[PDB]
Amino acid sequence: MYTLNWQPPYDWSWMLGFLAARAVSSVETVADSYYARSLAVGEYRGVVTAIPDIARHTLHINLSAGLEPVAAECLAKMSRLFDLQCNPQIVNGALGRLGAARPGLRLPGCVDAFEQGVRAILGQLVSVAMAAKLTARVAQLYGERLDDFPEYICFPTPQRLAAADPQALKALGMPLKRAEALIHLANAALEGTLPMTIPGDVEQAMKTLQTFPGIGRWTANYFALRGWQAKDVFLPDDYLIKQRFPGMTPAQIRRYAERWKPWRSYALLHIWYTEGWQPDEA
Numbered sequence: 001m002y003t004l005n006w007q008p009p010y011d012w013s014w015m016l017g018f019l020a021a022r023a024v025s026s027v028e029t030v031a032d033s034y035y036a037r038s039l040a041v042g043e044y045r046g047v048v049t050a051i052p053d054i055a056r057h058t059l060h061i062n063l064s065a066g067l068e069p070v071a072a073e074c075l076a077k078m079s080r081l082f083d084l085q086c087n088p089q090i091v092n093g094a095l096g097r098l099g100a101a102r103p104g105l106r107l108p109g110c111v112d113a114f115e116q117g118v119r120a121i122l123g124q125l126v127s128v129a130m131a132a133k134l135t136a137r138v139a140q141l142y143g144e145r146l147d148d149f150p151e152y153i154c155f156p157t158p159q160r161l162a163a164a165d166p167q168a169l170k171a172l173g174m175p176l177k178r179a180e181a182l183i184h185l186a187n188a189a190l191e192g193t194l195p196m197t198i199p200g201d202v203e204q205a206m207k208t209l210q211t212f213p214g215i216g217r218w219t220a221n222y223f224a225l226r227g228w229q230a231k232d233v234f235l236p237d238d239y240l241i242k243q244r245f246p247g248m249t250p251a252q253i254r255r256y257a258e259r260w261k262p263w264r265s266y267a268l269l270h271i272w273y274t275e276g277w278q279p280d281e282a
């Protein structure tokens, strides 16, 4: 049982709510007071559990025996998933009124960049629910079960998804193109062309990321945001975002969002979670 710290406020209800909707069956388990999921670091496999202690603003992490050797990297992954580094006072100060609603809003990251990349692609032109349902089938088919914890299955590894038959993934509910994008992503991960950690120059990296087959602007932005935890990325192509900005084109929305620099990623979250949100006038 390890412990990590965070700076108040931290809207935990919103965070687990966010992960619960996107949770992949037989990978993650999200509840009101904790989060848990299978996790593979090299040949080390197990179950990671995160328990927040709101009062003492400390997150308690529990690892199953198979992950102890790489505990540190497991702790590092949890910190990036829950954005423990965030300084709410600064972000809310810059965001101003926009963040006034819920100052405890955090940027949901990930546990592994290759996995998230896979999720972003699977999230293409489809709802959160449909996406999760699809990702579960993919994990069910190409994932490996935990010996000590039979109820859990590890997200498919790059090697496995590299040799997956395009048609096989196709049958799960995606176009051939989508299935080929994933296959390529798998090989990119194997070679090391896919940045597993946030790069010094995000824009350049995203640019390179889009030269990949099946990776558009939305997927690219979304991946950077969750996959690298980039704080200044907006999604002008996002379907929900369009709803929030009626009539305005992607370019206009992109122009509108410049006012939240250099925290557009946090701006994106708040806009996503303010129901009756609407733009100004000028």
Ligand SMILES: Oc1ncnc2cn[nH]c12
Binding pocket: 123, 124, 125, 126, 127, 218, 237, 238, 239, 240
């Ligand atoms: O592919 C996609 N493009 C833009 N917004 C969304 C939302 N979900 N999936 C999307």
